[PDB]
Design a protein around this ligand. Sequence first.
Ligand SMILES: Nc1ncnc2c1ncn2[C@@H]1O[C@H](COP(=O)(O)OP(=O)(O)OP(=O)(O)O)[C@@H](O)[C@H]1O
Length: 529
Amino acid sequence: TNFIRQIIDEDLASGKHTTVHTRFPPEPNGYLHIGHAKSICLNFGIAQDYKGQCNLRFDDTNPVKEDIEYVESIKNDVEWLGFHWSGNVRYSSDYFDQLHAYAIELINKGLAYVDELTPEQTREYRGTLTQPGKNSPYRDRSVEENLALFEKMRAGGFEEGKACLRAKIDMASPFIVMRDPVLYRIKFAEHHQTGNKWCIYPMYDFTHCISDALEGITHSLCTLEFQDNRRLYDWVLDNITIPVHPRQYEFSRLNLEYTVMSKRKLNLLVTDKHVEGWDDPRMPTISGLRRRGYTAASIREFCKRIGVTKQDNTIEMASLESCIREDLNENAPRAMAVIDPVKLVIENYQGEGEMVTMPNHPNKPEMGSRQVPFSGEIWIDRADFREEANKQYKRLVLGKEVRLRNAYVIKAERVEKDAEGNITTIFCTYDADTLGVIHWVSAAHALPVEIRLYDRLFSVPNPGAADDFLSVINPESLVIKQGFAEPSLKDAVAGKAFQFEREGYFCLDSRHSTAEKPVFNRTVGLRDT
RNA sequence: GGGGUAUCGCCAAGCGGUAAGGCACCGGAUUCUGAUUCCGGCAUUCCGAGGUUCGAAUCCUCGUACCCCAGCCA
Ligand SMILES: Nc1ncnc2c1ncn2[C@@H]1O[C@H](COP(=O)(O)OP(=O)(O)OP(=O)(O)O)[C@@H](O)[C@H]1O
């Protein structure tokens, strides 16, 4: 339970409400991100918990920043997380004629006027954070005059910025938001829903409260920056004929260590091609997380974990990463692949190669078993062999034995070096009556596989607070490798996390994999210690 | 000037009766993944100073710190 639910409980009990109706309202100007997921889980979660409704409403009030691509991707991610909205998808643009009708009521009551101060001037008259503002010389036009000027606006008679509609509140109010907040501005831009029907568009504050009222939203939940704004919310609803008055409650937004959430910024990474696109696996976007191999259930857990408070905060990746590991550890069928490979032959081995039965899950027999080809000329990961080591090192030293995964206890004997002091191959003896551990892959039966080792995108924890977040990108956010994996991975499906034993949970990258050359994104590493 | 917030390294319960939980972390026991699983340890102390009370993280003063607002963006 959190503060928002205690409020809802009181509301139900006191008989203030009988049903709860929330909404998630993203603007379609970018893909959704892990931050949005916190709001989604909150809004849609309360609905199903209290057997209530939650609308998906696209706040599409600014046509020059939104695109249809986003509305489709947004609907996509919402479902993927496992949530369904109430009834049909809604749009603020759905209320354009209603909004305009309400602007007129405001005008008719003298609570709004068409101002003509330029954009620079409007800023000047607004005062500062310590100095009150001042009434525009156009502030006292007659209702009749305002009706005329507004229709001129509506009818495209004014250039952009040459006139706008404003609420007539208080230029000296300590709330900067109540100093005659603009209600309509001219934009001769094709809207993705209403095409060119409109050339004057409503501002967020005017649109949002009226839309919540019309939809019968019982609790408008959004982030902390809107606490001041709440005053305008109520002011609008108090001066127009509407029969309900939704209440807004604010909770703090999610900040994740090492990542930027600002869609402006995420947009820069994409536009400047510093990442593949919105769903690149290093992005904090829901679709990127998906491609990265996270699971809708792991994200819901994350939300469940971070809580909901008024407290500003920054979660460490350790918490996110914890969630996906827990999920995958339980449901991921284990398999084997070698990322950095150095050849290892067993001379002692006689035969064209046998077959070893390995479990799909070392702790869950229920998940079945499989037939993995063993051999003499195998593949091993470089860092597993040590020509020289100490008691700690529990892998393959040039003097002792090491158990192969689910196979034979081999024994290191004779190395062979590459001219440049490197190791070309390892020769070891095997003990036919054997069946630390190390993973392997029969050279003869090995499947060529690309591996994409992903790390955090930024090299500082709050790249946001940097003078130039771009200059603080991690150059090792993605490190590609060519390795080998057992042939069963021949049947991996896009997004189906496997646990490459002793490395990390990996998943087939849709975007890149092909027939011969599959591509595996490393979702998250294993607890290395 | 206004609106907000202050509990462990990072989250977070608490709502006058004596500091939950989770992530990280340190042990130790199993383990053919240095994984998983188990065991145990991690706030006499709740931004600071005063005060009320039998008892205060919780009430009341008085400070201090941080966040948000001056888009015809949301
Ligand atoms: N980081 C966040 N943490 C929690 N909730 C968020 C976060 N960012 C946005 N939201 C919520 O998502 C809802 C939709 O956000 P919307 O896409 O309209 O704008 P925004 O993401 O705040 O701004 P921007 O488009 O500049 O990123 C908002 O009502 C807000 O409460």
